[PDB]
Design a protein around this ligand. Structure first.
Ligand code: BCL
Ligand code: BCL
Ligand SMILES: CC[C@H]1c2cc3[nH]c4c(c3C)C(=O)[C@H](C(=O)OC)c4c3nc(cc4[nH]c(cc(n2)[C@@H]1C)c(C(C)=O)c4C)[C@@H](C)[C@@H]3CCC(=O)OC/C=C(\C)CCC[C@H](C)CCC[C@H](C)CCCC(C)C
Ligand SMILES: CC[C@H]1c2cc3[nH]c4c(c3C)C(=O)[C@H](C(=O)OC)c4c3nc(cc4[nH]c(cc(n2)[C@@H]1C)c(C(C)=O)c4C)[C@@H](C)[C@@H]3CCC(=O)OC/C=C(\C)CCC[C@H](C)CCC[C@H](C)CCCC(C)C
Ligand SMILES: COC1=C(OC)C(=O)C(C/C=C(\C)CC/C=C(\C)CC/C=C(\C)CC/C=C(\C)CC/C=C(\C)CC/C=C(\C)CC/C=C(\C)CC/C=C(\C)CC/C=C(\C)CCC=C(C)C)=C(C)C1=O
Ligand SMILES: CCCCCCCCCCCCCCCCCC(=O)OC[C@H](COP(=O)(O)OCCN)OC(=O)CCCCCCCCCCCCCCCCC
Ligand SMILES: CCCCCCCCCCCCCCCCCC(=O)OC[C@H](COP(=O)(O)OCCN)OC(=O)CCCCCCCCCCCCCCCCC
Ligand SMILES: COC(C)(C)C/C=C/C(C)=C/C=C/C(C)=C/C=C/C(C)=C/C=C/C=C(C)/C=C/C=C(/C)CC/C=C(\C)CCC=C(C)C
Ligand SMILES: COC(C)(C)C/C=C/C(C)=C/C=C/C(C)=C/C=C/C(C)=C/C=C/C=C(C)/C=C/C=C(/C)CC/C=C(\C)CCC=C(C)C
Ligand SMILES: COC(C)(C)C/C=C/C(C)=C/C=C/C(C)=C/C=C/C(C)=C/C=C/C=C(C)/C=C/C=C(\C)CC/C=C(\C)CCC=C(C)C
Ligand SMILES: COC(C)(C)C/C=C/C(C)=C/C=C/C(C)=C/C=C/C(C)=C/C=C/C=C(C)/C=C/C=C(\C)CC/C=C(\C)CCC=C(C)C
Ligand SMILES: COC(C)(C)C/C=C/C(C)=C/C=C/C(C)=C/C=C/C(C)=C/C=C/C=C(C)\C=C\C=C(/C)CC/C=C(\C)CCC=C(C)C
Ligand SMILES: [Fe+3]
Lengths: 42, 245, 281, 54, 304, 53, 43, 54, 43, 50, 42, 53, 42, 43, 54
């Protein structure tokens, strides 16, 4: 490992990062659904 | 304010240009006075005070505070006295002013003309940390990263003769710059050659400033790993004086 | 008079012509043979400019103007009242500049220093000769050179530039402008940095070159160095003058139309020339 | 595949996160500007037409 | 045939210098590296850079200004990458028309220009603060900040003060390669041959003098590099033969000379003068004088 | 839940500076965009509503 | 994996203060947006 | 929170004070300039119209 | 933790002074805004 | 797999990400500059937007 | 190995890279099929 | 009450000089703005009131 | 103390500074009142 | 140096492919977008 | 304040006096020129009108 992180440290980092990414993606999906209802682009 | 004149044709542009003329006159006076902190008062050919000293007076003294507690008052008698050469082997060629002075002996050995040196303080130049600025590369961890490494090359003089070999380089550590080459002569003595007055070929170092006979009388450093400002000045003056002599 | 350290440097030798015949000083000025020639040429040029002012009938220093012979004269030696005086003054100026450069060379040889200063001056001399000799002769007449007047040569600059539309579009001209701006910027930075190191905050000791390197690395991430900055300033000035000379050399000799029209080959490359949209349709 | 976490064993989290934030902000601004530059999808223009703003 | 000291014959390198601490927060410094290509004429080290607050603000708002101009260009190109490259130097972000005066204009009609201008002004102010504070934390004399202030003065006269005095943002130059050259030419044409602006002539004299003085000083220093002349500060406190030989060269040449310290005062003032006089000359155009050739005729340096 | 560990990867000084700069830039951009749209320029709306000039 | 040299409790305390500040900022923004929607809706 | 004082544990007061002073001065100047450039909120113009000064 | 070397007591004292200054500034701004709203409302 | 014996993956991944982003943006811009394949134009034509 | 990575580390890095590449290419294929259905270019 | 501690933060000399420069520039700017406005140009008001010229 | 001054020195400086500021502000207030009486801008 | 060889080869391949694609796009006859527009009547 | 003299403990008297002299001269010249640009307060124009010089 170039960064010097432990495997468990990397796992925990990935877990919290994926929780944040999931929140971001869910918000984006809800926003896209709202836009599609309000003004569809297809 | 287009066409608005204070008097006659004098408007804001005229006021601005005349104010600039006054400011430029004052600025020229200030700049000229700031450049008279060294070399004054003027002297005659005999070293006595010159009757004419110029229209610009010498400014009031200013002090430079050094990192080691020393104070330098640049326009002062002490500053001029510390940098004044004595016992110069020179002779006037005419009773009139403005004529050259003739070297009485060996100009390169006596340090006159293009071989003149200034008696700088006999201490090495240091960096902000107090370490010597110029050190041989054997005392550092620097390595040659580009160009041609001259260590081990023969040294050829201006008369097409080999006078020795390069054994080490002296480097300005803060600036990461090579300033001198150390040469071991065929007699075993070591000298310092300024980088700015030599050429590095593919197989040799060529020094056209001086001939083979003059390499033995290059000024020396008291310590094998330290060179002082006075020694630097003497070596540079000796090497540069070879072009004329 | 002499500076307090000047005596040990006033030694004989270093002259190019005459040996010790002119190897003396007049006040602070070293004379030499080329100094004699410089004083002759400069005085003659100044007095001939004054005489041309007398012929013109004006004594306003900002209205005096000596004009070259008309374009129809070609390369002939013109009458003194019909442009010949301009040619004599041009010869005097060229002689004075060359003599000044050679006198600088002699002074360099006496002091045992390099010849960077006379080489750099020769660059400006080349620019001047480009404006008064090379370009007018390539265009076939002395009448294309600029006049000797404080604002009439500005009129000449304006007319020459507008001969080719907006002169901003000359590429060598853009390069020279950028180099001049860079030279001014670098001079400001160098003067400011050296003065700030020499004149620190009150109560602080004098700063080292390490301080200057640290400052410029902190500000913008790079420091060129003292030797580097001097080399860079000299090269910037020389390149600015050289590329200005090239820009004037190519204009009116191999290019005669508008430079703004020259810039349209990139637009008119056939693979996107007809593509609708944008500025150029 | 659950082995993706090993990216943090080869890439520095600080630089990755800084670059990701800059990239996401630039992308979002770019998409918003593209929508605004189109009068059909400019929500301010749509609101002006809908509510009769002047 | 002698060494002219324009390029180093050999390069040496060790660990990069990370800088003196003084009163600087070393946490804000980045790592450093080496670039051997830059070591031939100068230093090979791409040293650490200070980040701080002023640098971050300046970088963010300057990037915002740059990207605002870029997206305006992309809009003018109609999303076409080929049109973007074909007309890159012809795209222009123009100020609002004279009808809107100094008020906020619609986006399509100068609002984007105003937004970019505000971002640029914030970035420039932040960078000036950065210059001043980097000088202060190392204990230096703030000369760089005052020198930068003259260029800022010219820049703000061109875009802010003169537009305010003229009553409209329309007189400010646009953001474009060819368009701002056209703006310069049109300014000269509209104000009657700006050649006859006396402060324009002073600015040109200062620019020519800056080039001349830097040529002189660089050639002089390289000529005395035999004696370590480029170590200017040490020569200032401990005068060597390099300073004496340079002074004697110029004294024997033109009758007067400078010192190792005062030559830099000459340099800084000569370089400051071009922008200092240029700002005044631009500010006088249109507000006080609208035809410089007629003004020159009145004041006796143009023919009647 | 465990987002506090952000402060184990990023120093607060850099993060706080960047966040402040970002917020200032975004707020200025949005306000200027709204001001450059006459239908949402509140000064123009107030002028029309209250009969100024 | 602390690059900043911060412990767990110090990070938790700093995060708590940061979340209080962020909550205040977001609440003010929500109120401002509600007021703007009431005064001049953009949908 | 009552723990906001810990901001001074993160940043030097001089740095923050200078930044805040510059920011507040620039913001005030910008807002005054925006109001002055609008004729409806230029208080000198409004005063001239109201009192019949010109 | 401390990046500036200040102790918690010194930080609290400095923050108290800063909050007094900020409160005075904000109160003056609020009074000015009330006066402007009375004189010439922008809503 | 042997490519990672030659090239440092960090530089490879950074360069690949930059290249992919630039390529995607270029293709999207090419499609947007074509009114036939501009999906916003098709949407406003189909839905009758203003 | 100029990078210092052993054979096993290179193999596992390649495995992760190819998994990510396969996911990316599958998403690209699905997007292309959807575009072809909606607005064919051939 | 305890704002004197500001002088434990910034050097009085630089603060005093900068404050004086700022105050002078502000006063000159406001006076010039009033002069450039004919409604508040006190010389113009005086010449209209007293019937000069 | 960042400036190196003492508590007593800072307080003595502040008293004089506040006296000068109060004088300046009082003069400014009188000038503004006189202007408002002469040529009101509201 | 295999690294420089591969990097230069990749850059050259990308530049060549982009150049050929731009040449084809510049030609309306072989511009597949125009061809598809004409075939399917997108207009 | 009876303690204003301590200003001389803060600023060098020579610089203060020189700057004050330059500032006062420039201010006086500026005000006189402003009065001269206004024909209602140009005393030379008023004298010319009164005495019928031109
Ligand atoms: C370079 C391209 C153009 C040109 C374009 C411009 C433009 C554009 C401008 C000038 C300006 C000037 N030009 Mg011109 N100029 C050219 C060629 C020349 C030559 C020449 C022999 O080559 C000379 C001597 C001059 C001289 C001058 C000065 C009168 C003035 C300021 C220059 C300066 O400070 O430079 C830097 C040098 C120094 C700071 C050192 C001091 C030099 C002094 C000032 C020169 C004085 C000359 C004196 C009036 C006459 C000399 C002859 C006498 C018999 C001694 N020009 C050519 C034709 N020049 C400006 C001006 O104000 O014009 C009215 C201006 O706006
Ligand atoms: C047909 C065109 C007109 C003319 C019209 C004008 C106009 C109009 C102007 C000049 C100006 C200048 N002209 Mg003129 N000019 C003409 C002919 C000439 C000739 C000649 C014939 O030889 C010469 C030598 C000059 C020379 C000059 C300069 C002396 C002067 C100021 C230059 C400068 O520093 O600019 C550029 C420097 C700046 C703009 C300063 C910038 C400062 C800021 C803070 C820095 C950049 C901001 C930010 C950092 C940018 C991003 C950087 C990122 C790293 C990417 N002009 C003719 C007569 N000229 C200017 C002037 O002052 O005139 C009095 C000016 O406005
Ligand atoms: C790198 C090129 C730059 C440069 C370099 C440079 N110039 C130099 C040097 C260097 C390195 C010197 O060593 C030398 C010097 O000694 O400087 C102090 C010089 C010098 N650069 C000078 C000026 C100068 N340089 C200029 C430009 C520049 N010089 C370039 C930007 C300009 C411009 C742009 O206008 C001017 C005016 C002089 C101060 C000096 C050379 C002095 C000299 O030649 O002295 C002998 C001559 C006389 C004393 C007078 C002769 C007069 C004539 C006989 C009659 C007049 C003729 C002339 C054509 C009339 C012009 C009228 C104008 C209105 C057009
Ligand atoms: C005495 C007058 C001369 C002068 C002086 C001068 N200029 C100065 C200084 C001085 C003394 C400084 O201290 C200061 C400085 O720091 O210099 C290193 C500065 C400086 N003069 C500069 C430029 C400059 N000076 C000029 C002119 C001159 N400056 C005069 C000749 C000009 C001209 C001729 O037009 C220019 C362009 C800068 C190098 C610097 C001030 C830096 C600054 O203000 O930065 C803030 C502005 C920005 C950050 C703008 C945006 C920059 C980038 C475009 C951002 C976007 C790109 C993004 C970061 C990357 C994107 C990558 C991809 C995604 C595309
Ligand atoms: C660090 O080092 C350095 C120095 O030192 C420390 C220096 O000084 C200088 C030089 C800079 C010095 C002050 C600063 C400014 C200099 C100049 C700005 C340019 C301005 C020059 C302007 C006119 C020209 C001044 C003189 C000109 C030509 C010369 C005019 C004098 C004479 C014509 C008459 C010539 C007489 C000749 C022989 C003698 C005639 C007598 C006879 C019989 C014949 C530099 C660059 C430097 O970098
Ligand atoms: C019009 C431009 C040309 C101006 C007239 C020619 C200029 C040169 C005249 C003087 C040259 C000379 O003969 O040198 C000797 C003379 C006296 O020198 P010295 O005795 O050493 O003075 C100090 C002793 N008390 O020299 C002296 O008087 C010393 C003072 C130098 C003279 C100032 C000339 C200015 C040179 C630059 C011109 C442009 C200025 C721009 C500067 C902008 C700010 C940097
Ligand atoms: C024209 C008529 C000249 C005829 C005289 C011919 C004599 C040759 C010139 C000469 O000898 O110059 C020397 C002059 C005097 O100085 P010096 O002799 O060296 O020592 C005396 C100091 N106690 O050294 C000098 O520098 C003369 C002093 C100059 C005084 C002001 C000059 C202003 C005008 C200079 C021309 C421009
Ligand atoms: C013109 O062309 C257009 C624009 C039309 C098309 C171009 C389009 C593109 C290029 C679209 C997007 C491509 C991408 C790549 C979009 C982004 C996808 C991603 C990668 C989104 C990432 C979201 C990640 C988010 C919010 C971060 C979640 C992480 C959150 C805090 C960080 C948590 C990790 C932590 C905190 C460190 C502390 C933990 C420990 C254990 C110390
Ligand atoms: C176009 O866009 C527009 C302009 C429309 C959008 C406008 C936007 C914005 C961005 C508005 C503002 C956002 C902010 C963040 C405004 C400011 C909020 C603040 C934080 C105001 C701070 C006021 C603080 C003030 C005056 C300082 C009071 C401090 C006073 C002296 C200092 C006391 C502290 C001290 C003295 C040190 C003494 C103690 C010791 C122990 C030495
Ligand atoms: C053109 O495109 C448009 C503009 C139309 C749309 C594009 C829009 C975007 C991209 C909008 C925004 C995206 C974001 C990411 C907006 C910002 C969201 C955030 C992240 C706001 C954060 C606000 C944070 C705030 C107030 C917190 C400041 C924190 C503090 C006071 C807490 C300080 C903590 C401290 C002091 C010390 C504690 C120390 C110890 C030892 C306990
Ligand atoms: C376009 O925008 C417009 C122009 C419309 C509006 C923009 C407006 C602004 C931003 C206006 C002003 C904001 C300010 C901040 C105005 C100034 C407020 C202040 C703070 C004025 C300070 C006056 C201070 C004065 C007189 C004090 C000078 C101090 C002195 C006499 C005291 C001397 C101190 C010490 C003598 C010596 C004692 C030494 C010892 C050792 C005891
Ligand atoms: C793919 O490419 C992307 C999209 C990524 C980016 C490409 C970008 C480009 C192509 C950027 C720029 C091209 C140019 C041509 C940039 C600008 C060149 C120039 C020549 C800028 C010149 C500005 C020149 C002058 C005088 C401006 C001086 C500006 C000022 C003082 C600023 C004025 C400040 C504030 C006016 C007004 C504040 C008032 C209000 C009401 C906000
Ligand atoms: Fe220098």
């Amino acid at each position: 490992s170039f960064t010097g992180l432990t495997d468990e440290q990397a796992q925990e980092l990935h877990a919290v990062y994926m929780s944040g990414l999931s929140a971001f993606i869910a918000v984006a999906v809800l926003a896209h659904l709202a836009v599609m209802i309000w003004r569809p682009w297809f | 304010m287009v066409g608005v004149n204070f008097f006659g044709d004098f408007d804001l542009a005229s006021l601005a240009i005349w104010s600039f003329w006054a400011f430029l006159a004052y600025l020229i006076y200030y700049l000229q006075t700031e450049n008279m902190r060294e070399g004054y008062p003027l002297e005659n050919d005999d070293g006595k005070l010159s009757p004419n000293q110029g229209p610009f007076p010498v400014p009031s003294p200013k002090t430079f505070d050094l990192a080691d507690g020393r104070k330098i008052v640049v326009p002062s008698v002490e500053n001029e006295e510390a940098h004044r050469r004595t016992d110069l082997a020179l002779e006037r060629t005419s009773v009139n002013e403005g004529y050259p002075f003739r070297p009485t002996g060996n100009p390169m050995l006596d340090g006159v003309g293009p071989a003149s040196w200034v008696p700088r303080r006999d201490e090495p130049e240091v960096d902000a940390h107090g370490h010597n600025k110029i050190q041989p590369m054997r005392k550092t961890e620097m390595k040659v990263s580009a160009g041609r490494d001259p260590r081990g090359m023969p040294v050829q003089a201006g008369d097409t003769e080999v006078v020795g070999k390069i054994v080490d380089m002296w480097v300005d550590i803060p600036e990461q710059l090579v300033r001198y080459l150390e040469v071991e002569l065929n007699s075993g003595k070591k000298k310092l050659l300024p980088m700015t007055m030599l050429k590095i070929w593919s197989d040799r170092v060529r020094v056209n400033a001086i001939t083979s006979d003059l390499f033995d009388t290059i000024p020396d450093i008291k310590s094998p790993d330290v060179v002082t400002k006075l020694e630097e000045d003497k070596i540079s003056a000796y090497v540069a004086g070879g072009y004329m002599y | 008079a002499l500076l307090s350290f000047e005596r040990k440097y006033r030694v004989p030798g270093g002259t190019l012509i005459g040996g010790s015949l002119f190897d003396f000083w007049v006040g602070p000025f070293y004379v030499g043979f080329f100094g004699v020639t410089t004083i002759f040429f400069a005085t003659l040029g100044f007095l001939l400019i004054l005489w041309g002012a007398a012929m013109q009938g004006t004594w306003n220093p900002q209205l005096i103007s000596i004009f070259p012979p008309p374009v129809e004269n070609g390369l002939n030696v013109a009458a003194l009242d019909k442009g010949g005086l301009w040619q004599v003054i041009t010869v005097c100026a060229t002689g004075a500049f060359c003599s000044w450069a050679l006198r600088e060379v002699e002074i360099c040889r006496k002091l045992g220093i390099g010849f960077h200063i006379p080489v750099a001056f020769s660059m400006a001399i080349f620019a001047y000769l480009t404006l008064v000799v090379i370009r007018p002769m390539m265009m076939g007449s002395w009448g294309y050179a600029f006049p000797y007047g404080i604002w009439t040569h500005l009129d000449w600059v304006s007319n020459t530039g507008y001969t080719y539309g907006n002169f901003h579009y000359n590429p060598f001209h853009m390069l020279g402008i950028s180099l001049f701006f860079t030279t001014a910027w670098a001079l400001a930075m160098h003067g400011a940095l050296v003065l700030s190191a020499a004149n620190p905050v009150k109560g602080k000791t004098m700063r080292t070159p390490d301080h200057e390197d640290t400052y410029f690395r902190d500000l913008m991430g790079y420091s060129v160095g003292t030797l580097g900055i001097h080399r860079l300033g000299l090269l910037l000035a020389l390149n600015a003058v050289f590329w200005s000379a090239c820009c004037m050399l190519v204009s009116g000799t191999i290019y005669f139309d508008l430079w703004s029209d020259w810039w349209y080959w990139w637009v008119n490359m056939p693979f996107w020339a007809d593509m609708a949209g944008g500025i150029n349709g | 595949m659950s082995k993706f976490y090993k990216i943090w064993l080869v890439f520095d989290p600080r630089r990755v996160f800084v670059a990701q934030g800059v990239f996401l902000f630039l992308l979002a601004v770019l998409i918003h500007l593209i929508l605004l530059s189109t009068p059909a999808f400019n929500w301010l223009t749509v609101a002006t037409a809908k509510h009769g703003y002047v | 045939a002698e060494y002219q000291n324009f390029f180093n014959q050999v390069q040496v390198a060790g660990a990069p210098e990370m800088g003196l601490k003084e009163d600087v927060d070393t946490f804000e410094r980045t790592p450093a590296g080496m670039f051997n290509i830059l070591g031939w004429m100068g230093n090979a080290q791409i040293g650490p850079i200070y980040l701080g607050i002023a640098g971050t603000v300046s970088l963010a708002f300057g990037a915002a200004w740059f990207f605002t101009i870029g997206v305006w260009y992309w809009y003018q190109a109609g999303f076409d990458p080929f049109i973007f490259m074909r007309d890159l130097f012809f795209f222009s972000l123009e100020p609002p028309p004279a009808e809107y005066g100094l008020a906020i204009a619609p986006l399509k009609q100068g609002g984007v220009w105003q937004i970019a201008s505000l971002f640029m002004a914030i970035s420039v102010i932040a960078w000036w603060v950065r210059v001043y504070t980097r000088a202060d934390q190392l204990g230096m004399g703030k000369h760089m900040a005052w020198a930068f202030l003259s260029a800022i003065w010219l820049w703000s006269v061109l875009g802010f003060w003169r537009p305010i005095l003229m009553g409209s943002w329309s007189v400010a130059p646009p953001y474009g390669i060819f368009s701002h050259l056209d703006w310069t030419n049109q300014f000269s044409l509209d104000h009657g041959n700006l050649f006859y602006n006396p402060f324009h002539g002073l600015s040109i004299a200062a620019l020519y003098g800056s080039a001349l003085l830097f040529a002189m000083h660089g050639a002089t220093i390289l000529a005395v590099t035999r004696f370590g002349g480029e170590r200017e500060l040490e020569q200032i406190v401990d005068r060597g033969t390099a300073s004496e030989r340079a002074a004697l060269f110029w004294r024997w040449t033109m009758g007067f000379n400078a010192t190792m310290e005062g030559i830099h005062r000459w340099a800084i003032w000569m370089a400051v003068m071009v922008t200092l006089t240029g700002g005044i000359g631009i500010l006088l155009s249109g507000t006080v004088v609208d035809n410089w050739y007629v003004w020159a005729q009145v004041h006796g340096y143009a023919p009647v």
